[PDB]
């Protein structure tokens, strides 16, 4: 499957792609404003994610830091990134179908559209100014808008009992972005696409 990752932001982002225990394709790449990166993701990939990282510094060997979404200090991510991170999430060729969503469960850093480039399903988008509107207690000093689990580490915000409800914080993410997961047990906003669809993730779509 082909994913075109496009940076429409006015600022540089360092794209990342991982399934948590391994890189997808090269795992990460710097994208200046307007740059695109086409990656290939193996069919059957389960639990893949793509995200943006901001304000990164890397040395010649690809080691360094990012202010949002840092993945163990690597340019070429092999694991998931440090919140806050708006997440494009996908599982491919799962009983003949693909499943896509955007999630704010790990906070929000950069606005995103995640759309098929092939027929048979719709895209999802979270492009509201969540960082600008972020509740004071969720603001990350390193940049971005933290989820409440990251901030407070409670069973209710983290849904670690499998019994949690919406919260004042999850409702903020949901109000700004109805089409993205706002907490672990949110009513799903997952889209079902034909198996072996192709996609585009656009940072700062609007």
Curated annotation (Swiss-Prot):
Keywords: Cytoplasmic vesicle, Disulfide bond, Signal, Taste-modifying protein. It is found in: Cytoplasmic vesicle. Disulfide bonds join 9-204, 56-66, 71-77, 121-193, 126-177, 134-145, 149-158, 159-164. It holds the Pfam family Thaumatin. Its main location: cytoplasm. InterPro entries: Osmotin/thaumatin-like_sf, Thaumatin, Thaumatin_CS. The keyword Signal applies. GO terms for cellular component: cytoplasmic vesicle. Taste-modifying protein; intensely sweet-tasting. It is 100000 times sweeter than sucrose on a molar basis. Belongs to the thaumatin family. This is Thaumatin I.
């Amino acid at each position: 499957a082909t994913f075109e990752i496009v940076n429409r932001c006015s600022y540089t982002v360092w794209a990342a792609a991982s399934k948590g225990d391994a890189a997808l394709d090269a795992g990460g790449r710097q994208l200046n404003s307007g740059e695109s990166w086409t990656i290939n993701v193996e069919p059957g990939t389960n639990g893949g994610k793509i995200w943006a990282r901001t304000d990164c510094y890397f040395d010649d060997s690809g080691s360094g830091i990012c202010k949002t979404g840092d993945c163990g200090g690597l340019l070429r991510c092999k694991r998931f990134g440090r919140p806050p991170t708006t997440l494009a999430e996908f599982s491919l060729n799962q009983y003949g179908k693909d499943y896509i969503d955007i999630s704010n469960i790990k906070g929000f850093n950069v606005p995103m559209n995640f759309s098929p480039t092939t027929r048979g399903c719709r895209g999802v988008r979270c492009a509201a100014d969540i960082v600008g509107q972020c509740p004071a207690k969720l603001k990350a000093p390193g940049g971005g808008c933290n989820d409440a689990c990251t901030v407070f580490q409670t069973s209710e915000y983290c849904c670690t009992t499998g019994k949690c409800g919406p919260t004042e914080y999850s409702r903020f993410f949901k109000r700004l972005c109805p089409d993205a997961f706002s907490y672990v047990l949110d009513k799903p906003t997952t889209v079902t696409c034909p198996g072996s669809s192709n996609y585009r993730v656009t940072f700062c779509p609007t």
